[PDB]
Design a binder for these strands. Sequence first.
RNA 1: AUAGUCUCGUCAACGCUCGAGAGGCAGAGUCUCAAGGAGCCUCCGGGGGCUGUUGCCAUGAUAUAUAUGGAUGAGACAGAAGUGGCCCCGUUGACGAGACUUAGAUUAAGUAGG
RNA 2: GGUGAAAUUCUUGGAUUUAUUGAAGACUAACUACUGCGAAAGCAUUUGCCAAGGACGUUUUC
Lengths: 114, 193, 58, 311, 94
Amino acid sequence: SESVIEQIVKYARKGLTPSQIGVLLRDAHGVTQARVITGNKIMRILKSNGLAPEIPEDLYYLIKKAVSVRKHLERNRKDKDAKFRLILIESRIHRLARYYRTVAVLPPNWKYES
Amino acid sequence: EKRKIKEQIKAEKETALQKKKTKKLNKLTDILEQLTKEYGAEINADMVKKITDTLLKNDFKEEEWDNVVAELFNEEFYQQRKKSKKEEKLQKKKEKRKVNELVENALEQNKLALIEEVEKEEEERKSRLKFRYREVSPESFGLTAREIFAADDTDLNEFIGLKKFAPYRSKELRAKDKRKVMKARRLREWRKK
Amino acid sequence: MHLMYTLGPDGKRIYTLKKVTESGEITKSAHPARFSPDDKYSRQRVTLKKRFGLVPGQ
Amino acid sequence: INLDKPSNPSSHEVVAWIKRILRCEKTGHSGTLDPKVTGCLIVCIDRATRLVKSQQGAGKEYVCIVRLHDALKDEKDLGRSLENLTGATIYESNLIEFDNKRNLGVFWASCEAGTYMRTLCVHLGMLLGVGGHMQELRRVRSGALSENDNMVTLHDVMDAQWVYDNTRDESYLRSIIQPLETLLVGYKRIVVKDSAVNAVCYGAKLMIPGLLRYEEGIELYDEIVLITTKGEAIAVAIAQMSTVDLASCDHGVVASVKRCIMERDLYPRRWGLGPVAQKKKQMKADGKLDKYGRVNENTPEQWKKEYVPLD
Amino acid sequence: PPDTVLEMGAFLHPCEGDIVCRSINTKIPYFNAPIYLENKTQVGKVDEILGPLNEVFFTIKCGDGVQATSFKEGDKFYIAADKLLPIERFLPKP
RNA sequence: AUAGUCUCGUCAACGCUCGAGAGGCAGAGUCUCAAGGAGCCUCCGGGGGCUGUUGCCAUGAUAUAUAUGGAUGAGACAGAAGUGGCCCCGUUGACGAGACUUAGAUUAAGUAGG
RNA sequence: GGUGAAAUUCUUGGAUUUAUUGAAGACUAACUACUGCGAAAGCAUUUGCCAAGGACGUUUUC
């Protein structure tokens, strides 16, 4: 499946999420069993090709949610609920970023910005 | 209402994809029949698959279809009773159907490319952060992609974890893990088991 | 269509192109109506034919 | 059913539609119409589908319209050209009407298939020199029945089935549907006793004691119909003696069943009840005749002289 | 409460405090069979069966506390599947 | 045993419209096509006629496209989808499979016992 | 007016009541609820817009 690996590398060059890339590969190949191709296998194939993500997928999705609720607070400043949960998710992503810095997957030089 | 709108959009996208697929398929088999008539000899399925891959990479249109016909005119692509007669014609029709099935398999190989082309056409009709990958050192780890796909995800995780293959870690630990994992006896035992 | 007919004195068809014969009788169309198996209009036809006694066997 | 086929579908599709409407177990037809051709179609239902093979090769009569490409200089010569093409395939033909301003001619002909009508139109246009093609085609007679012999449409069949399903009236279905014996009018009739009807339905060769009446003009190896006194048809058979031989002899075989139309046990089983039959049974039981019934050594010579096996 | 319900009737007329319904289903209900709504709630009992064979109607006698004017056109009324009879049962025997 | 009848699946031969498709029929959705417009004249703002054997849409079908048809219709999506909605030539002979009989056709007032 | 009985106040200039108009702030009568939602605070007029969730299933570079 060298052509499949080339297509996976081309999709990874398009800035797609590894889970989204695996879902697209399963949809294109018609994989009835999800155990054959998984996100861990996609990450292993990307490491074999030499591509590793800059940020974790969960941290990226949390940052996207934080950006969305920040845009909502910019639209509506009178709301208390979105501000409170923004404080909560910033606490959560700060804890996860500290865990990632200790695990050294995320470089310790990079710091989360509010 | 949102569910109905999403279902309608999905149905429209599926119909557009089906129309693009059948247009590509019938033009491609017409070009293949024309090339078979011009050459006068049977064409291998591997050469047809290579030509289909080249056409998919070329992003073929009608002018690019003429260009593909010209490339087929080049030497590289050119080199690549009555009841019994009716049965032979039926066998030839079955061979043509097998060639069409090979063309459909090639289109399924480029189904990601076809979906990308359909999405580009939809974006052109509409006329309207990011995730980045850092560079890392490649390691094949002695296993091919087909060999990895022929093994379970649990066995691959047990053999080598994602944390053990951390890209932003020290190189000495990665070298030690590679040296401990590249044993020929362990690989032979895993292959035999 | 072109094939037209009138019913003869003995009950047999006589075919012609002409819309009106020499005697002045208006000719009929020799071709029957289109049919579909999914015809859901048997009830209306039977009712209207029963109002005027045009059902065979009535 | 004598049916007026519409000009969109084919004959087989119409037959399959009738099978769905009437909920038949089996439906057939003898003559096949092209999809564009309209006209007479004979539809056989269930047991009537046994007659379909006997209905093959029957005479067909068509009424056709030919369109001429150019106006004619001489009118009646057209009829002469029609007389040039009839006979030795179109057997007989007759030009009903012609309009030179409309360039259209309607004519009746006796033919075998609808394609020969198109060939006749092309040949008429070629022999005239102006050129012509088929405009419309209609079959006005297929087989024994014609278009005047109670022809109904598919709407009539659907409406009659709806009437019987919902109103429970049977007169409209009985009006549209004809007995299968309408297909057997031209055959020569032989009347069978009610005791022999079930034996003939079981495949036995009809003999002298089962015979009641025989039609004059029956020849050797001729197609016949075996009928009861109620007029229903038992079978289509091959006659084995002529009329004078039917009148003359006292023992013999008169018919052999080609195709059995009647249901097997519609009549009770009354064979083996007779003087000669019970005499043979008694001598078989006693041992004068053997188990199969052939001549044995213990059989007296009087029975051998009086009785001869026909088989 | 019934285990399963089937689409029995469609609202046609509220006449005289009873519900007239076109019989959507192709089988004949029991007399005095309970009629339910799709949350399996009893609205009334079958009072009368009428109409031709092609178009069967039935009249539901509403239970107490239910008014006939409260319903609207296009409403559906449901019955337990045990309370049905084949149409060929009432037809004359061959 | 022999023979016949009914319901079937295969082979061979013989004819025909030469027979499973990018097929046809039936059905559902969307779109297009009906001299519904325009200009002249008129008779009493309305009505009639003409340009108008015109224009619009479909068809090269053994084919006059200066033609033939148009709602009692045609075409595109559709070389698609669907068929678990239907249809795709007959005759003769042989073989094989499930069966029913092996039939000479009675009775001018009954059946079963003592 | 209100009270157990009272009392303070308003006025024949019209108190109070009834009908209409204009302006201001507030709220969403019954259904209606210690079994719904929310971390709490608290939350039922119509119509849109925005962001985020609860329970369930498939799972996760976990």
